[PDB]
Amino acid sequence: SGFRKMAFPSGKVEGCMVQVTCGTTTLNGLWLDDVVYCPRHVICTSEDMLNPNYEDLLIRKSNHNFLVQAGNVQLRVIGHSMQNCVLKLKVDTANPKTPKYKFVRIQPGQTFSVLACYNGSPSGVYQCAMRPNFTIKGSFLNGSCGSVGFNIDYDCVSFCYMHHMELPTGVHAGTDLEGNFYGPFVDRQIAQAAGTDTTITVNVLAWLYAAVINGDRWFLNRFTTTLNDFNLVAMKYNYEPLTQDHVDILGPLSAQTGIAVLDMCASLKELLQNGMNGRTILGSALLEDEFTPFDVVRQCSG
Amino acid sequence: SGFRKMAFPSGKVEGCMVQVTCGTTTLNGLWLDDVVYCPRHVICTSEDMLNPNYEDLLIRKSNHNFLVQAGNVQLRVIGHSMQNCVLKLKVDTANPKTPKYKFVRIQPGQTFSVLACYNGSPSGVYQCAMRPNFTIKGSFLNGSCGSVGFNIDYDCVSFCYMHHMELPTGVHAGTDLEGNFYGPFVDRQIAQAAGTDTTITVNVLAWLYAAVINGDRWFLNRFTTTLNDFNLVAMKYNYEPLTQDHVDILGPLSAQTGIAVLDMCASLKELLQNGMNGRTILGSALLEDEFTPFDVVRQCSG
Numbered sequence: 001s002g003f004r005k006m007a008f009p010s011g012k013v014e015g016c017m018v019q020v021t022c023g024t025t026t027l028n029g030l031w032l033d034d035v036v037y038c039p040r041h042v043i044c045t046s047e048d049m050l051n052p053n054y055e056d057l058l059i060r061k062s063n064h065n066f067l068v069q070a071g072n073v074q075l076r077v078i079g080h081s082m083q084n085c086v087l088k089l090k091v092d093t094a095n096p097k098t099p100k101y102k103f104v105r106i107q108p109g110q111t112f113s114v115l116a117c118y119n120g121s122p123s124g125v126y127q128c129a130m131r132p133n134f135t136i137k138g139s140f141l142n143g144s145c146g147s148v149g150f151n152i153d154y155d156c157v158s159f160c161y162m163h164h165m166e167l168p169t170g171v172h173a174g175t176d177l178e179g180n181f182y183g184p185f186v187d188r189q190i191a192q193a194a195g196t197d198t199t200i201t202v203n204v205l206a207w208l209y210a211a212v213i214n215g216d217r218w219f220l221n222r223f224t225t226t227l228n229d230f231n232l233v234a235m236k237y238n239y240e241p242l243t244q245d246h247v248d249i250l251g252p253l254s255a256q257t258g259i260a261v262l263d264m265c266a267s268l269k270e271l272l273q274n275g276m277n278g279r280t281i282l283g284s285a286l287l288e289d290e291f292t293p294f295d296v297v298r299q300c301s302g
Numbered sequence: 303s304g305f306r307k308m309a310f311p312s313g314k315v316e317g318c319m320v321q322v323t324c325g326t327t328t329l330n331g332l333w334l335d336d337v338v339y340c341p342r343h344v345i346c347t348s349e350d351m352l353n354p355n356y357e358d359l360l361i362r363k364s365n366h367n368f369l370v371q372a373g374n375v376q377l378r379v380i381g382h383s384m385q386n387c388v389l390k391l392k393v394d395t396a397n398p399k400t401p402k403y404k405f406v407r408i409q410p411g412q413t414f415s416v417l418a419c420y421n422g423s424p425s426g427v428y429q430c431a432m433r434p435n436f437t438i439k440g441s442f443l444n445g446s447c448g449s450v451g452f453n454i455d456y457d458c459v460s461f462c463y464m465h466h467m468e469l470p471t472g473v474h475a476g477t478d479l480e481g482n483f484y485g486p487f488v489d490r491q492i493a494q495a496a497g498t499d500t501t502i503t504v505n506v507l508a509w510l511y512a513a514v515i516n517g518d519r520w521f522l523n524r525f526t527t528t529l530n531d532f533n534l535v536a537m538k539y540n541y542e543p544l545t546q547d548h549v550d551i552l553g554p555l556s557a558q559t560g561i562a563v564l565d566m567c568a569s570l571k572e573l574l575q576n577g578m579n580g581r582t583i584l585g586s587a588l589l590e591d592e593f594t595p596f597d598v599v600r601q602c603s604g
Contacts, residue, residue, distance in 0.1 A: 001441075001442070001443065001468060001472050002439060002440050002441040002442060002472065002473075002474065003441055004426075004428040004430070004440065004441035005307065005428060006418065006425075006426035006427065006428045006441060007309055007426060007427050007428065008426060008427070009312045009313070009316050009417065009424040009425070009426065009427055010311045010312050010313055010427065011311070011312055011313025011314075011316040011317065011424075012313075014311050014313040015313065115311065116308065118604045122311040122313075123308075123311070123600075123604060124306075124308035124309060124310060124311065124601070125308065125309050125310070125311055125312065125427055126306040126307060126308045126309065128306070137304060137585070138304050138306065139303075139304040139305055139306035139308060139601060140303070140304060141303065141602075141603075141604045142604075143604065144604070166303060170303050170304065170516070170517065171304075172304065214472070215472065275580075278577075280588070283439070284586075284587070284588075285586070285587030285588045286582070286586075286587045298425075299426070299441060300443075301443075302420045302425060302443045302444075302445065302446070
């Protein structure tokens with residue numbers, strides 16, 4: 001038993017991390033088969049980032065201007081192509097450590113593991129959620145650009161995130177592996193509105209189920225509610241509206257615990273209206289929304 | 303910027319995980335050079351665990367009774383030896399994925415990453431602290447025994463923990479890699495007192511420094527205190543007494559932020575006496591004590 005915010009094992013991604021240098025800028029790249037993927041702003045100086053013309057900047061670069069190093073192994077760049085906000089560097093060697101992989105664009109509220117890297121070298125791994133407003137609340141210092149987010153299903157790595165930017169507000173923005181930003185953000189050093197975020201209600205509910213399974217049950221009450229009644233509370237407290245699709249995804253957890261989804265909603269309603277009264281749930285003094293229903297089942301079923 | 307509970311990259315440990323089966327019991331082993339390390343209670347049935355005579359139970363086992371599988375590769379066991387609470391199975395093949403490694407016995411209050419595994423297969427990685435009472439608050443289901451805890455320094459893996467037991471209270475106990483339990487615990491299915499735990503004060507202070515570095519500063523006050531005055535508060539709130547050794551280890555963080563350690567103690571004193579007033583620090587509504595000063599510097603310096 002016990003419930004932890006758990007990242008996927010990072011080894012399959014570690015074998016794909018490389019260092020990419022273009023002129024004076026060095027960040028991280030992802031080496032899969034004979035292609036290295038990295039943020040296109042590797043071609044920018046610090047001053048270019050105010051208003052870069054990426055097409056013009058890239059035209060001044062040739063294959064030999066990109067230095068790619070996988071640990072001690074230097075790779076030979078034989079083609080380059082910009083796809084949205086990512087650069088794809090064709091190299092002459094297929095990465096022998098390429099795992100089975102897919103590129104996926106995840107939905108807001110889903111979770112993934114981030115392998116934070118600097119100079120092509122992994123430093124740590126953590127689990128986080130894509131916020132409803134398409135930011136992530138990560139840990140990214142200078143040089144972490146090109147670090148990637150991913151999920152693992154058996155032997156297949158689904159890459160979903162590449163880190164590009166820290167907003168002036170301190171939250172993080174990036175792209176899928178086709179180079180399309182999540183959210184409204186652009187790869188330019190300007191102030192950028194993220195817009196109102198909300199709490200991921202279906203994830204909070206999943207975590208409440210995780211809590212019941214592990215013996216934290218004090219928040220279970222004698223009340224029930226309706227979807228529409230609960231959603232009135234959700235709107236007041238800036239929670240995502242709960243849909244039947246969310247109720248359906250919570251089905252297995254409701255079955256395992258014998259607690260109907262709408263009963264759990266009435267517990268959550270009381271928690272929102274009355275707070276936690278100085279108590280904790282699974283070691284937290286706030287309502288946690290970075291575990292999906294799939295995360296809870298995964299961790300509880302091994 | 304940003305601050306996350308970050309695990310070490312797990313790949314070097316993933317390459318060492320194997321499945322160990324003895325009779326009906328299957329758990330995880332650690333394959334380093336030509337030795338596989340695992341909990342000795344792999345030789346027990348469910349009923350043996352009430353009061354096992356490990357010496358007598360092991361005498362009934364020969365090398366061929368231990369089945370060791372590294373993924374699809376079956377290993378040949380050519381010797382076996384019990385060292386305290388671990389079994390050491392000599393195999394005929396050196397693990398070609400053996401990282402540079404050491405075995406270390408960590409001190410209470412230090413942190414490490416756990417690679418949770420089932421049937422020899424990694425499922426996730428998380429960071430935790432050794433509690434002052436030598437338990438850990440982990441995520442360990444049936445079959446996770448033999449999962450290991452570790453730190454990484456450059457290219458060297460320092461293994462510090464092997465998981466053995468879930469106490470009836472739901473917390474976790476295990477050994478160093480020489481098989482010596484942390485704490486008073488034994489590998490027997492009986493009720494076992496863990497004893498009073500306390501909060502790791504030097505870690506809370508480190509995390510407050512992490513918070514200041516990242517812009518959370520509301521808890522900084524106009525007061526200061528003394529070591530002895532603060533320790534009077536620490537004792538009232540079941541915090542570890544702060545020593546000069548702790549103050550010294552916080553030195554670099556004090557220098558970086560310009561906040562004297564005893565000034566930070568006065569902030570923490572006010573937080574203990576008055577609570578957090580419905581505010582949060584680094585996204586937490588409680589005082590976090592699972593980051594060491596070294597953890598904070600690591601994450602803040604990349």
